[PDB]
Structure 1
């Protein structure tokens, strides 16, 4: 009878996650609020590891059209396949995805990424009065990341369209079903017209490397939509949430100011501590399976809340405490197993650049109380409406 998700749109995690984590079962039945579909939900680290590293629990089958699902609408343009990352790896493009997303891409981009974060912070520090870290730092930094490393150079209008399509499509509520679907239609039709054009510009952005490698307009458009939904609301949501975390922990920031070698530990702890998705990664049983004693029938979908797992006290001592340099296991902020986020290198690079830009300038603080922060309600990927801030 428990419906999913739990409407915890701010950084305050729903109490249900601890309730289920403490209950007497390793997986719990829920019902999708948006479709009425029955789903399984995992909240414990030990169980999550087992699930996400068993390839008989399939991601592609859970993303497929017609699957039991937590989203109110299918997350694809009608009539399209909607599984770009599989299609690209199927077309033999793993080596290109590594060149575009891996350590060589980070070496290519980290210089300007850090120059940009400093330039943005410096411009804000030269201003008299208050400013908005969401609109004045995160949005330009994450837009530049998406443009220069993933899509190619976008005009302001094009960026606004894609950002709007992501915010409208990647929702549990707040928009009608047909508005939600049409957001994917608009983005797909944008890339049907513009994906190849974007590839024919200067740069080494991933969509270029995909278009240049040894692909139909429909496949390249699916790649563009993938890069928007995978890179834009995630990075912008996470950077906003990590800034809120840092601004609430001035002692930790002061330690990073004094000991810049401790920033990478703080980046990893932010990935554990700062919640992002309001839903769950999901996988469909491709045959009858058993997880810690509970039978999962072929075709049933099992969900893992990364947020729940990252706050599991059996995994992390004092899980609700922001503690850079804690010595526990790998966080789940990028997932686990074969589908571990391939954007994790660029993500870490932009997070580190943000953490260092903040640590170099102590005194940065919120210009309102944490409870005065307003949150977009119903996004898959949490994001505050604004982060009023000041020195």
Structure 2
């Protein structure tokens, strides 16, 4: 069985449920991209055990030379590629909390909600249809990255970074050397500009890092991290969440009537809406055992968050979008020590988007869901456009 399963749209591959129901708690696959053997976990209970055992190491699975699911290493050649580790290493946990935590949300939620309303209001004033991907998600996610993470970017700089992320974070669709060069271009951009970006107005995280008590190569790796972790993820997820909402007008109607139910809908979108077409992954740093299956030192085990989020043993009717369902914690931000530190800002922008939609009932797709076209091969699913109208 080769990996990934080429399920580039919101329709999850049937392989995930087939492995979930199989008689083994971990299943062998082979990387289509490298030929590397890998282990794959699809059950919630097993995923909790793996992701909360620190002897399964994320950094070891990211290291140059690890068995891997990507066709190329996710780093500019000659660089370390372990930015968030390096930053927590140098003693910046405090600064990451300031730039990503509840205080950052308090600083930014005002303009984020103003911008979501402004973008939706301009679309509502247009005669004709519009594109929720290009006209709502792209400006909102670009503003999030610029104001809270990198600093003010020109349009051309934003486009270059967006292109680098779409070219480098891929299972297929580009040559290996094009994929590698995307990381080289991004790194060389931040070698030239990361310090410049820190010296602009704002409280964006890259400034906070650059002002804390770092070499240009380290600051450049911080910039590349914020692009790959913050830009295609937020844009892919907001696009997918809008598709989910547009396909559930009864749910939107309930949020319109009961705005206090929006936070529950945000959490259910994170469970229900698929994002990555690959898996979180960890290297066994010694011989380990998971639900009876031996994992030798150096072997890499992946967890599909999509598969876990749709596990019927965890969630009753897992394929139903049900805000306010009462089951366990979703896996949309992961689990354990590597739980997405962007979760506060992500939840902020997701909530701003849900509220903007819930205030304007009647918003609908201008084509059929099957006429939606998907970028093929991205790590993080994204439709090419979302034609919509009132």
| Shorter-chain TM-score tier | over 0.9
Q: Report the alpha carbon displacement of residue 327 of structure 1 after superposing the two structures with TM.
A: 0.1
Q: Secondary structure of 2:269's match?
A: helix
Shift of 1:89: 0.5
Cα deviation for residue 203 of structure 1 reads 0.1
Displacement of 1:260 after TM fit?
0.1
3-state SS, counterpart of residue 187 of structure 2? helix
For each residue in 1:112-152, what CA deviation from the matched residue of structure 2 results, as whole angstroms up to 9, or x when unmatched? 00000000000000000000000000000000000000000
Query: Cα distance, 1:163 vs. partner?
Result: 0.1
In structure 1, the residue matched to 2:26 is: 27
Task: Measure how far apart 1:267 and its partner are.
Answer: 0.1
- Give the TM-score normalised by structure 2: 1.00
Q: CA RMSD in A?
A: 0.1
Distance in 2 between residues matched to 1:90 and 1:65, nearest whole Å: 19
Matched with 1:283 is: 282
Tell me, in whole angstroms, the C-alpha distance in 2 between the residues paired with 1:385 and 1:295: 42
Distance in 1 of aligned mates of 2:365 and 2:216:
46
TM-score normalised to structure 1 length: 1.00
1:206 Cα deviation after fit: 0.1
SS at match of 1:79: coil
**Post-superposition CA distance 1:87-117 (Å, at most 9, x none):** 0000110000000000000000000000000
Partners of 1:335 and 1:16 in 2: CA distance: 21
After superposition, the C-alpha distances for 1:29-58 in whole angstroms (9 at most, x for unaligned) are: 000000000000000000000000000000
Matches within 5 A, 1:113-132: 113-132=112-131
Distance, in Å, in 1 between the alignment partners of 2:304 and 2:203 is: 34
Where 2:33 maps in the other structure, the secondary structure is coil
- Tell me the distance in 1 between the aligned counterparts of 2:192 and 2:293: 48
Per the alignment, in what secondary structure is the counterpart of residue 299 of structure 1?
A: coil
Deviation per CA, 1:252-307: give whole Å up to 9, x if none: 00000000000000000000000000000000000000000000000000000000
Alignment deviations for residues 301-331 of structure 1 (CA, whole Å, 9 cap, x no partner): 0000000000000000000000000000000
Q: Deviations over 1:180-210 (max 9, x none)?
A: 0000000000000000000000000000000
Report how far residue 86 of structure 1 moved.
Answer: 0.3
CA distance in 1, matches of 2:37, 2:286: 17
5 Å-filtered alignment, 1:133-172, equals 133-172=132-171
SS of the counterpart of 1:348?
Answer: helix
Q: Matched residues in 2 for 1:39 and 1:83: separation?
A: 21
**CA distance in 1 between partners of 2:344 and 2:85 (Å):** 20
Name the SS for the 1:120 alignment partner: helix
1:214 CA drift (Å)? 0.1
Partner SS state of residue 12, structure 1: coil
- SS of the equivalent of 1:303 reads strand
Give structure 1 stretches of 5+ with no counterpart.
none
2:350 aligns with: 351
- C-alpha separation in 2, matches of 1:133 and 1:83: 34
CA distance in 2, matches of 1:177, 1:70: 14
Distance 1:239 1:211 in 2: 29
- How many Å separate the matches in 1 of 2:10 and 2:178? 27
Q: Shift of residue 59 of structure 1?
A: 0.2
Q: How many residues align?
A: 390
| CA distance in 1: counterparts of 2:70 and 2:200, whole angstroms | 35
Structure 1 residue 358: Cα displacement: 0.0
- 1:182 corresponding residue in structure 2: 181
Displaced runs of 4+ in structure 1, greater than 4 A?
Answer: none
Q: Tell me the distance in 2 between the aligned counterparts of 1:91 and 1:181.
A: 27
Q: Quick one: distance in 1 between partners of 2:111 and 2:95?
A: 22
Q: C-alpha separation between the residues in 2 aligned to 1:92 and 1:57?
A: 23
Instruction: Report the alpha carbon displacement of residue 74 of structure 1 after superposing the two structures with TM.
Output: 0.1
Is the partner of 1:68 in helix, strand or coil?
coil
